[PDB]
Amino acid sequence: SRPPVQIEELIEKPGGIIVRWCKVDDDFTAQDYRLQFRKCTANHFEDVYVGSETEFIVLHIDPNVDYQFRVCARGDGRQEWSPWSVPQTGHSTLVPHEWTTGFEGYSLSSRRNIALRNDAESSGVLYSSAPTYFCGQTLTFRVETVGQPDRRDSIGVCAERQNGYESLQRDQAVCISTNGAVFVNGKEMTNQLPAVTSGSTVTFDIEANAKLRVTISSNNREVVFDWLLEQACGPLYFGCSFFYPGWKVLVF
């Protein structure tokens, strides 16, 4: 008849929200907690976590959208859930995905989100402007226009901005090439995705050395695999590389 649990912290990040709750009546003995969320615009809460832990990382949230969260608890001999905490509203933070400006061989759109491979010599991979891929984000690229394909073509994600290599087909990176081949720490997988054409999207979903699970989607097919990284799930760079002119990639 009193809420035994309240939300204690809301940790708003670019790719999700961590909700942490605390038992506010020491005399309550909790078996299970139940966390729900909804968009502030929606008329229905849905369960996102039921279990004995007192925090949960909520990854399926759109940026720029407010969500409401509430939590309750149930005792061991009582089947009925307790009253709910006061609800709390949260949102992910906003860190735009943009390409590096001033990198030879690539021309950018005014908002720095579309990169075109031009006729100039290029020193290597065009990286994001900073490591702005955060775990929990769905990172989406769209291929606007194409050029001649080449074995060193890549689109992907990696730990560090490294100027040496010709592509992201290298250690501490995951990428796809323009033939649909997928590389994990520079090692090509047997399974391929359909090769990109203009209009194709490529999506990366990465969820927690360190063992991450990576889902790459493209042209209505997916591959899923393990990626072992020596960093943690800290923010990652993204990048692309194309040898021949005409390839143009939007990042969302």
From Swiss-Prot:
Record keywords: Coiled coil, Cytoplasm
Ranges for domain Fibronectin type-III: 3-96
One GO BP: positive regulation of transcription by RNA polymerase II
The protein, known as: Cytokine receptor-like factor 3
Function: May play a role in the negative regulation of cell cycle progression.
Family statement: Belongs to the cytokine receptor-like factor 3 family.
Cell location: Cytoplasm
GO CC entries: cytoplasm; cytosol; plasma membrane
Organism: Mus musculus
Phylogenetic placement of the source organism: Eukaryota, Metazoa, Chordata, Craniata, Vertebrata
Molecular function per GO: identical protein binding
Residue range from the parent sequence: 179 to 442 of 442
Chief location of this protein within or outside the cell: cytoplasm
